[PDB]
Design a binder for this molecule. Structure first.
Ligand SMILES: [Mg+2]
Lengths: 352, 62
């Protein structure tokens, strides 16, 4: 088992012409050993041995059954049990054998990553809570979109977290940043996925079409791990401890106006604590893909029938349609702003 | 402008016309008295002249 260096030295000194016996004398090795190593391929310094029997082998299946069906992980309890069965050794071997079965405590070290310019964006929601806006109880939610390289922040308040609202907020973010990223990171929302099909993710077909339309590649971090999108979560903490702490409002339009003004004043103006530069300069450094001229229409699409007289009803509303549109089927495109339009076989109805 | 160069020329001036400037009363350059003074040998090594300050490392390794 002469080590790498010893074997190299033996072979080299032997090939140099030095006599073998005095080589052995110099290196303090037996002459037979040195001579055998002369005609050897490479330094031998490794011995392979397979596993061997231990004391806790007969009890091992029983302990494994205890762990995997009774959920017992108390080394003292298992030791006391098996001691009656016949075991006589200490607990160290038991702990060593049982350690792999134990759950892996979550780490505390946190890797840091710096995405390339115009290469990544992050999105998330924040359930603000229930408020009485204009005498109406609604569930307010905050949508936050954080750029990855410039740390920009766009935000907007909404009353619902429907796929339509998500897509519209993404449109607003893309317009705000003057382009679309090459990658957009969400969490595992059903408006973007439909579960992990054996490790792989199954994208919602409509959302996949939307992404292919705007060209941005979706990504999802992982189940029950929000660290991977720390930028946007920390931006949420920033906004909810700086803007929505004492600000008072009565209309969501007013709140959104105040939020945009606040962002453009301080949030996207104050230099970041890590990049140490105003986010707008980095934004100017960003290179996002151009937006399409026509935005992906995100509006509720329903089919309704006009009554005999010509009175058409949608939600708690009523219209008066010409007699030619009575008893037929029409399309009611409801934009998220409340602009309802009526269509009949492509044509647009001048609804009264 | 560099204060280091100013101190370099200061050291030259001290060696030239400050430590070799005889006093009117004594009439002898102070260097001779310094030579005859008792300057016990210094330990030949310098006690560390580096700021010592503790810092906690965040769980980010920072
Ligand atoms: Mg979320």
């Amino acid at each position: 088992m002469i080590t790498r260096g010893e074997f190299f030295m033996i072979k080299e000194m032997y090939e140099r012409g030095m006599s073998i016996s005095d080589i052995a004398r110099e290196l303090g090795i037996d002459r037979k050993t040195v001579r055998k190593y002369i005609h050897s391929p490479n330094p031998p310094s490794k011995s392979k041995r397979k596993q061997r029997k231990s004391k806790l082998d007969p009890f091992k299946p029983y302990l494994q059954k205890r762990m995997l069906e009774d959920g017992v992980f108390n080394s003292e309890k298992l030791f006391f049990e098996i001691r009656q069965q016949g075991y006589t050794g200490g607990k160290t071997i038991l702990k060593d054998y049982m350690k792999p079965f134990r759950e892996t405590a979550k780490k505390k070290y946190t890797v840091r990553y710096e995405t390339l310019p115009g290469e990544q964006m992050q999105v998330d929601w924040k359930e603000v809570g229930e408020v009485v806006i204009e005498g109406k109880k609604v569930k307010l939610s905050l949508f936050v979109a954080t750029l990855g390289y410039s740390r920009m922040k766009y935000a907007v308040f909404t009353t619902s977290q429907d796929q339509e609202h998500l897509m519209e907020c993404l449109i607003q973010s893309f317009k705000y940043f003057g382009g679309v990223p090459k990658k957009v990171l969400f969490d595992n929302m059903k408006t973007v996925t439909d579960g992990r099909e054996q490790g792989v993710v199954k994208w919602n077909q409509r959302f996949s079409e939307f992404a292919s339309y705007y060209g941005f590649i979706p990504k999802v971090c992982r189940p029950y791990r929000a660290q991977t999108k720390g930028k946007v979560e920390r931006a949420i903490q920033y906004i909810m401890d700086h803007f929505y702490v004492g600000t008072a409002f009565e209309s969501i339009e007013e709140l959104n106006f105040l939020l945009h003004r606040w962002l453009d004043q301080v949030a996207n103006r104050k230099p970041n604590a890590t990049t140490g530069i105003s986010p707008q300069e980095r934004w100017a450094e960003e290179s996002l893909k151009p937006l399409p001229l026509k935005d992906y229409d995100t509006s509720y699409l329903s089919y309704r029938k006009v009554h005999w007289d010509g009175s058409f009803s949608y939600k708690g509303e009523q219209w008066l349609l010409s007699a030619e549109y009575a008893g037929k089927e029409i399309l009611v495109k409801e934009r998220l702003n409340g602009d309802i339009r009526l269509y009949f076989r492509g044509e647009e109805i001048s609804h009264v």
